[PDB]
Design a protein around this nucleic acid. Sequence first.
RNA 1: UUACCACGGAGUGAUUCAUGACUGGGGUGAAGUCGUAACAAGGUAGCCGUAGGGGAACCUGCGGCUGGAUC
RNA 2: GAAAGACCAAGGGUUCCUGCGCAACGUUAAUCGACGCAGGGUUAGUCGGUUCCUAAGGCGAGGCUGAAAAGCGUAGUCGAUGGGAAACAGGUUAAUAUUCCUGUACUUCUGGUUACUGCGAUGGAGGGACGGAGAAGGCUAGGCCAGCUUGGCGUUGGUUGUCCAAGUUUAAGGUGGUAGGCUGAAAUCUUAGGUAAAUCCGGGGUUUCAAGGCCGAGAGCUGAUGACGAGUCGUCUAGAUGACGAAGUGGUUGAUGCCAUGCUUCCAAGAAAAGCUUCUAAGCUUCAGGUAACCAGGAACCGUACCCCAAACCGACACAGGUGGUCGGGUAGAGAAUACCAAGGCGCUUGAGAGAACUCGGGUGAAGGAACUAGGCAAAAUGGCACCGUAACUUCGGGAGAAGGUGCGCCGGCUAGGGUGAAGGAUUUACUCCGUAAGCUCUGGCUGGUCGAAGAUACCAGGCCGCUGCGACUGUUUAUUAAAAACACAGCACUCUGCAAACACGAAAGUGGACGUAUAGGGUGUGACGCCUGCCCGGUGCCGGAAGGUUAAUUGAUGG
RNA 3: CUUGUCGGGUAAGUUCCGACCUGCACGAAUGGCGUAACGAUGGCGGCGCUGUCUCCACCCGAGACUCAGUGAAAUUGAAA
RNA 4: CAUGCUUGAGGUUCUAACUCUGGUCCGUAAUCCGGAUCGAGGACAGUGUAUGGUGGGCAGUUUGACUGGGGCGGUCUCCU
Lengths: 272, 44
Amino acid sequence: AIVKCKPTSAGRRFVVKVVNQELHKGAPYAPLLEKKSKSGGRNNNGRITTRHIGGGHKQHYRLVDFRRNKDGIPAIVERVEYDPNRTAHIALLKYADGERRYIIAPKGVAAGDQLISGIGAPIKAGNSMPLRNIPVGSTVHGIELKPGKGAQIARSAGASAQLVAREGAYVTLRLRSGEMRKVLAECRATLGEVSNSEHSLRSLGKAGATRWRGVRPTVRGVAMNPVDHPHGGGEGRTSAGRHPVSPWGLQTKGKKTRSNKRTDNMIVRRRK
Amino acid sequence: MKRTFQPSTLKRARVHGFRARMATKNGRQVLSRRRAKGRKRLTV
RNA sequence: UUACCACGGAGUGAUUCAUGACUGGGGUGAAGUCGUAACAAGGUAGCCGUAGGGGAACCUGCGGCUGGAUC
RNA sequence: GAAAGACCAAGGGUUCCUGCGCAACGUUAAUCGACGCAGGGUUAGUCGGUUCCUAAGGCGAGGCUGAAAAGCGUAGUCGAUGGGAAACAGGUUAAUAUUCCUGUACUUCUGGUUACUGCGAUGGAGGGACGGAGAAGGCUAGGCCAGCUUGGCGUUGGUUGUCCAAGUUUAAGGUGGUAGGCUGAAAUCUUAGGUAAAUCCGGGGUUUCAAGGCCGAGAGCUGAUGACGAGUCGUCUAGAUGACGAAGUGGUUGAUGCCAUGCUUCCAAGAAAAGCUUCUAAGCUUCAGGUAACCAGGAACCGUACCCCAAACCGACACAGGUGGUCGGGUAGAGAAUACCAAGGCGCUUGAGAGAACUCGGGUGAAGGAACUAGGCAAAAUGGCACCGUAACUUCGGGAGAAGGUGCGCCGGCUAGGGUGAAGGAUUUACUCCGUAAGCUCUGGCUGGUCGAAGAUACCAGGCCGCUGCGACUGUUUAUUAAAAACACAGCACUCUGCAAACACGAAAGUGGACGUAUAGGGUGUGACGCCUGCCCGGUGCCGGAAGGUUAAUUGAUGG
RNA sequence: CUUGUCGGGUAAGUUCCGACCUGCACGAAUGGCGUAACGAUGGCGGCGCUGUCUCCACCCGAGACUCAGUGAAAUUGAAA
RNA sequence: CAUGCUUGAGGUUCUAACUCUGGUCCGUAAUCCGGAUCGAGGACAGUGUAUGGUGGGCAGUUUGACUGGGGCGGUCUCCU
Ligand SMILES: [Mg+2]
Ligand SMILES: [Mg+2]
Ligand SMILES: [Mg+2]
Ligand SMILES: [Mg+2]
Ligand SMILES: [Mg+2]
Ligand SMILES: [Mg+2]
Ligand SMILES: [Mg+2]
Ligand SMILES: [Mg+2]
Ligand SMILES: [Mg+2]
Ligand SMILES: [Mg+2]
Ligand SMILES: [Mg+2]
Ligand SMILES: [Mg+2]
Ligand SMILES: [Mg+2]
Ligand SMILES: [Mg+2]
Ligand SMILES: [Mg+2]
Ligand SMILES: [Mg+2]
Ligand SMILES: [Mg+2]
Ligand SMILES: [Mg+2]
Ligand SMILES: [Mg+2]
Ligand SMILES: [Mg+2]
Ligand SMILES: [Mg+2]
Ligand SMILES: [Mg+2]
Ligand SMILES: [Mg+2]
Ligand SMILES: [Mg+2]
Ligand SMILES: [Mg+2]
Ligand SMILES: [Mg+2]
Ligand SMILES: [Mg+2]
Ligand SMILES: [Mg+2]
Ligand SMILES: [Mg+2]
Ligand SMILES: [Mg+2]
Ligand SMILES: [Mg+2]
Ligand SMILES: [Mg+2]
Ligand SMILES: [Mg+2]
Ligand SMILES: [Mg+2]
Ligand SMILES: [Mg+2]
Ligand SMILES: [Mg+2]
Ligand SMILES: [Mg+2]
Ligand SMILES: [Mg+2]
Ligand SMILES: [Mg+2]
Ligand SMILES: [Mg+2]
Ligand SMILES: [Mg+2]
Ligand SMILES: [Mg+2]
Ligand SMILES: [Mg+2]
Ligand SMILES: [Mg+2]
Ligand SMILES: [Mg+2]
Ligand SMILES: [Mg+2]
Ligand SMILES: [Mg+2]
Ligand SMILES: [Mg+2]
Ligand SMILES: [Mg+2]
Ligand SMILES: [Mg+2]
Ligand SMILES: [Mg+2]
Ligand SMILES: [Mg+2]
Ligand SMILES: [Mg+2]
Ligand SMILES: [Mg+2]
Ligand SMILES: [Mg+2]
Ligand SMILES: [Mg+2]
Ligand SMILES: [Mg+2]
Ligand SMILES: [Mg+2]
Ligand SMILES: [Mg+2]
Ligand SMILES: [Mg+2]
Ligand SMILES: [Mg+2]
Ligand SMILES: [Mg+2]
Ligand SMILES: [Mg+2]
Ligand SMILES: [Mg+2]
Ligand SMILES: [Mg+2]
Ligand SMILES: [Mg+2]
Ligand SMILES: [Mg+2]
Ligand SMILES: [Mg+2]
Ligand SMILES: [Mg+2]
Ligand SMILES: [Mg+2]
Ligand SMILES: [Mg+2]
Ligand SMILES: [Mg+2]
Ligand SMILES: [Mg+2]
Ligand SMILES: [Mg+2]
Ligand SMILES: [Mg+2]
Ligand SMILES: [Mg+2]
Ligand SMILES: [Mg+2]
Ligand SMILES: [Mg+2]
Ligand SMILES: [Mg+2]
Ligand SMILES: [Mg+2]
Ligand SMILES: [Mg+2]
Ligand SMILES: [Mg+2]
Ligand SMILES: [Mg+2]
Ligand SMILES: [Mg+2]
Ligand SMILES: [Mg+2]
Ligand SMILES: [Mg+2]
Ligand SMILES: [Mg+2]
Ligand SMILES: [Mg+2]
Ligand SMILES: [Mg+2]
Ligand SMILES: [Mg+2]
Ligand SMILES: [Mg+2]
Ligand SMILES: [Mg+2]
Ligand SMILES: [Mg+2]
Ligand SMILES: [Mg+2]
Ligand SMILES: [Mg+2]
Ligand SMILES: [Mg+2]
Ligand SMILES: [Mg+2]
Ligand SMILES: [Mg+2]
Ligand SMILES: [Mg+2]
Ligand SMILES: [Mg+2]
Ligand SMILES: [Mg+2]
Ligand SMILES: [Mg+2]
Ligand SMILES: [Mg+2]
Ligand SMILES: [Mg+2]
Ligand SMILES: [Mg+2]
Ligand SMILES: [Mg+2]
Ligand SMILES: [Mg+2]
Ligand SMILES: [Mg+2]
Ligand SMILES: [Mg+2]
Ligand SMILES: [Mg+2]
Ligand SMILES: [Mg+2]
Ligand SMILES: [Mg+2]
Ligand SMILES: [Mg+2]
Ligand SMILES: [Mg+2]
Ligand SMILES: [Mg+2]
Ligand SMILES: [Mg+2]
Ligand SMILES: [Mg+2]
Ligand SMILES: [Mg+2]
Ligand SMILES: [Mg+2]
Ligand SMILES: [Mg+2]
Ligand SMILES: [Mg+2]
Ligand SMILES: [Mg+2]
Ligand SMILES: [Mg+2]
Ligand SMILES: [Mg+2]
Ligand SMILES: [Mg+2]
Ligand SMILES: [Mg+2]
Ligand SMILES: [Mg+2]
Ligand SMILES: [Mg+2]
Ligand SMILES: [Mg+2]
Ligand SMILES: [Mg+2]
Ligand SMILES: [Mg+2]
Ligand SMILES: [Mg+2]
Ligand SMILES: [Mg+2]
Ligand SMILES: [Mg+2]
Ligand SMILES: [Mg+2]
Ligand SMILES: [Mg+2]
Ligand SMILES: [Mg+2]
Ligand SMILES: [Mg+2]
Ligand SMILES: [Mg+2]
Ligand SMILES: [Mg+2]
Ligand SMILES: [Mg+2]
Ligand SMILES: [Mg+2]
Ligand SMILES: [Mg+2]
Ligand SMILES: [Mg+2]
Ligand SMILES: [Mg+2]
Ligand SMILES: [Mg+2]
Ligand SMILES: [Mg+2]
Ligand SMILES: [Mg+2]
Ligand SMILES: [Mg+2]
Ligand SMILES: [Mg+2]
Ligand SMILES: [Mg+2]
Ligand SMILES: [Mg+2]
Ligand SMILES: [Mg+2]
Ligand SMILES: [Mg+2]
Ligand SMILES: [Mg+2]
Ligand SMILES: [Mg+2]
Ligand SMILES: [Mg+2]
Ligand SMILES: [Mg+2]
Ligand SMILES: [Mg+2]
């Protein structure tokens, strides 16, 4: 549930926590962990390419299985765990022949379940099958875009998509952003929505809680000098005397930036 | 007060050493320029 | 010499009277100005609660009542 | 004296010790010196490197990219600030010692002999292997007290005794498996898994048992009939030498050190690889290789002097500066604060006078008490523990140590508790359970007496209150005149982005965003919280529209 | 304009607090108006305390002064 | 009007050029890179060259003189 802390300090007044008592509280499954090191927002030239990144806690990477291609073998959920890399929970499966694996946890799965995959699987939440044999009108998550590549769409906490229409070798589905998209019907998906949907009710509470996650302060351009930002300059407190713009000179109050032109036919209608 | 020169023998060799200059062609220009003028040291 | 103790001191509260620049409504007044909201179906039927709006009586939405005329 | 004492690392490089010197160097003289000359001085299987392993990162055969130079990167191989074998005590020099000597240990490798055998990796499994906070213990170092041994009988009243002084030490290792922590165990039948195989790991079924297995400080015993030990004696010359050598025990207290990489709990979810154990593939199989016991031998190379919170390092100086880590005693004390001392170290490389104005750093001050001044600047004042008591307002936490008040030294009388701990008792007979008189040690209660001007007596150690502006708060900033009302902030809103994402760095390959996926990522503004955020789309932007008008390269009818 | 005017605080208040509205030239996310807690933040007022002051006096150390040793600096056309 | 051989634009489809920061095989002991083969897209995308738009993101520069100091204002040529 959500927990609201008492105002015992100045920095505790506005903290609202997402505390789940069902989560495992031992060590993670060691054979499925590998090291990841922080970058600071720097590329291989050593330059800051994405700013406001730095610091945080040390984290291991969990080898989550996004392909789910052990078709026909039943599985059992051993536990639901915490992942530092997602906003969603993960589940440790145990197939009928050893082979423990991590998957993105669906909404209602706790401790037993069967979670089989492939053609001919039932239509309960947590099962994975190709988009051809998924009933029209159902809610899906973890949508694959290219056959054999794994889930890319609808993976964060509480995410889902609707399967709306089916026509030919393709299939149309409404994305969480309001966009209608057509996807190859050979691609796979999982039924239901993603767990941890209450993640959006939290409140960090203090400035140090943002630094724990590796985010550095944002200085706004009207507080700079003309040599630093197009918004900088002025005597006293000014208001960016031009139309609002990026640090590199790009308009940011409504100007579109999509220029793909190769994947255009896959867009049935845009999110507006 | 802390001053600008904080000695370190390992960091000195890795920036200004002989093998550090021999690695790039601009470092090798430095060495040939110091051989032409007749420097006794040639590297630190 | 000790104990008790009146007057008198110090600090901080409660309560109650009078008064206060300036402000808010109410009542009473006379041949003043603006409209016509109610009483007849009062010329958009009136009231009740609530919300928004408007020089003002008031108007409009939502739910309710007949203490509403013709039929 | 939590250093101005010792010791590591970095840095320096002979400054170290001894003879001979004083020109220059040393803010003065110098017979002295971190100064001049000349000799000497650093001893390792176990310390630190090297060798083995990897992190960030570097380089990078082929490769991809690029006018050239070159950029990125795969296989790979470098890179500690981390992982990974093993030693202590005593003696000795002018200068080295965990290195030499004495005594007692430990680790690893090589070559033989014997006995018995399935050996084999670059590949599979296991292990190595780890966060913040907090709390109950157990223990040890260390500290005190008592007893003991040796010596003493005090320039001035007393001091043969409930008197004074000193010493009362001893390691690694071996044995021991304890306080304590974790975990069910075994047999048998199998197998959509661990890229191939597997007797190993993982999964499944059946039977049996309620007990094994793994870590683990420390005590005790032994090392040790030895070393050490005030001192006594003999020889040599106020000093060296050889021999001998007393006591060397009990009780309390007790760590921030060890058990502990443990246990509990919380979110921000907490290194890798090798050494190590085990399984097998390609191969051998009566050579190879492996496991035990005994015998013999080895453990290379480099650094070890000296300073090291400083006169030897970084600051031009023998410069109130800076410099990572470890140890850290007594009496008071909450304490690593503070004061007086211990071990140990030092009096800071110009002195002597005299006692003017004035300057610097302080002490006391009549009667006033902010009249000073831009401004209570500076100074004065307050200051501890226990108990009583405490307002508006409030986001119900706070405000609050609000404000204010009372007690406190020393010596007796009576009295109540805790820890440790003989004797005894129990059975699991022994590294065990209960429990213990005295002794030692730690908490209290109510009752007198007494001295001073004053008992939180020194050092140490909050001044408080009432109205307002600004910013919600903790934080950050102009190294060297500005610390703020400026920046950040949690929260809020707009907008962009469907993943080969938007965006950014790159002539490019590529890289970040992100091993993320719209509850996500970027940009912009505002800035906790409460109540709210009104009218204008004419201008300039952005978004949508496609009919019409204008409109580029290109083409080339017509005319001349 | 301006030390606007009225009230309070003082013996006396160009600052302060509460109002009025004539806003030279406030105003709603370059946010408007409030707000407990917090601040080496700005303004004003009290209690205590005092060498801040009337108005300075005495005392103690380190210099200044003298003697011995060593021994600078900026400056400077020439100077009766 | 019918057909014929051409020809501007439009729409649909196909696969064989091209593309894949999709799967599995080999080089190989390798998340690079190649080759093979499946799958997807598809004459689009993308790159070269020519051309219109946008473009303080960035660049090289300009922004007069007189003048009872400069600036503001005025004046700057010709006739009486
Ligand atoms: Mg907090
Ligand atoms: Mg690992
Ligand atoms: Mg950002
Ligand atoms: Mg993250
Ligand atoms: Mg938080
Ligand atoms: Mg922000
Ligand atoms: Mg911004
Ligand atoms: Mg911002
Ligand atoms: Mg600013
Ligand atoms: Mg600025
Ligand atoms: Mg810049
Ligand atoms: Mg600019
Ligand atoms: Mg300014
Ligand atoms: Mg302004
Ligand atoms: Mg500004
Ligand atoms: Mg320098
Ligand atoms: Mg050369
Ligand atoms: Mg008081
Ligand atoms: Mg009072
Ligand atoms: Mg009273
Ligand atoms: Mg009153
Ligand atoms: Mg009144
Ligand atoms: Mg009046
Ligand atoms: Mg009406
Ligand atoms: Mg009417
Ligand atoms: Mg009516
Ligand atoms: Mg009408
Ligand atoms: Mg009516
Ligand atoms: Mg009512
Ligand atoms: Mg109504
Ligand atoms: Mg309404
Ligand atoms: Mg109303
Ligand atoms: Mg209306
Ligand atoms: Mg309504
Ligand atoms: Mg109605
Ligand atoms: Mg001290
Ligand atoms: Mg000292
Ligand atoms: Mg020292
Ligand atoms: Mg050195
Ligand atoms: Mg030197
Ligand atoms: Mg010497
Ligand atoms: Mg010497
Ligand atoms: Mg001599
Ligand atoms: Mg002489
Ligand atoms: Mg000298
Ligand atoms: Mg001299
Ligand atoms: Mg000197
Ligand atoms: Mg010498
Ligand atoms: Mg590397
Ligand atoms: Mg490279
Ligand atoms: Mg090459
Ligand atoms: Mg290496
Ligand atoms: Mg190391
Ligand atoms: Mg190490
Ligand atoms: Mg190590
Ligand atoms: Mg020595
Ligand atoms: Mg030895
Ligand atoms: Mg391994
Ligand atoms: Mg580690
Ligand atoms: Mg923990
Ligand atoms: Mg911890
Ligand atoms: Mg003891
Ligand atoms: Mg005796
Ligand atoms: Mg005597
Ligand atoms: Mg006597
Ligand atoms: Mg012993
Ligand atoms: Mg031992
Ligand atoms: Mg035990
Ligand atoms: Mg040595
Ligand atoms: Mg030494
Ligand atoms: Mg030292
Ligand atoms: Mg000196
Ligand atoms: Mg110094
Ligand atoms: Mg420091
Ligand atoms: Mg002490
Ligand atoms: Mg202190
Ligand atoms: Mg002292
Ligand atoms: Mg002393
Ligand atoms: Mg001493
Ligand atoms: Mg001196
Ligand atoms: Mg003075
Ligand atoms: Mg003074
Ligand atoms: Mg003074
Ligand atoms: Mg004084
Ligand atoms: Mg006196
Ligand atoms: Mg006085
Ligand atoms: Mg007095
Ligand atoms: Mg007074
Ligand atoms: Mg005054
Ligand atoms: Mg005055
Ligand atoms: Mg003054
Ligand atoms: Mg002051
Ligand atoms: Mg004073
Ligand atoms: Mg003072
Ligand atoms: Mg003082
Ligand atoms: Mg208060
Ligand atoms: Mg008090
Ligand atoms: Mg008395
Ligand atoms: Mg007080
Ligand atoms: Mg007060
Ligand atoms: Mg106000
Ligand atoms: Mg003000
Ligand atoms: Mg601020
Ligand atoms: Mg602030
Ligand atoms: Mg504010
Ligand atoms: Mg606020
Ligand atoms: Mg505010
Ligand atoms: Mg803080
Ligand atoms: Mg604080
Ligand atoms: Mg400054
Ligand atoms: Mg400053
Ligand atoms: Mg400050
Ligand atoms: Mg300052
Ligand atoms: Mg700032
Ligand atoms: Mg970005
Ligand atoms: Mg967003
Ligand atoms: Mg931003
Ligand atoms: Mg702002
Ligand atoms: Mg702000
Ligand atoms: Mg801000
Ligand atoms: Mg604001
Ligand atoms: Mg417009
Ligand atoms: Mg318009
Ligand atoms: Mg348009
Ligand atoms: Mg004024
Ligand atoms: Mg005024
Ligand atoms: Mg007045
Ligand atoms: Mg004043
Ligand atoms: Mg005032
Ligand atoms: Mg006012
Ligand atoms: Mg006015
Ligand atoms: Mg304003
Ligand atoms: Mg607005
Ligand atoms: Mg404004
Ligand atoms: Mg305000
Ligand atoms: Mg602060
Ligand atoms: Mg601040
Ligand atoms: Mg204030
Ligand atoms: Mg005053
Ligand atoms: Mg005087
Ligand atoms: Mg004097
Ligand atoms: Mg002289
Ligand atoms: Mg002299
Ligand atoms: Mg990329
Ligand atoms: Mg194309
Ligand atoms: Mg094109
Ligand atoms: Mg082009
Ligand atoms: Mg510009
Ligand atoms: Mg520019
Ligand atoms: Mg420019
Ligand atoms: Mg030029
Ligand atoms: Mg120019
Ligand atoms: Mg020009
Ligand atoms: Mg001019
Ligand atoms: Mg003028
Ligand atoms: Mg003139
Ligand atoms: Mg003039
Ligand atoms: Mg003139
Ligand atoms: Mg003039």
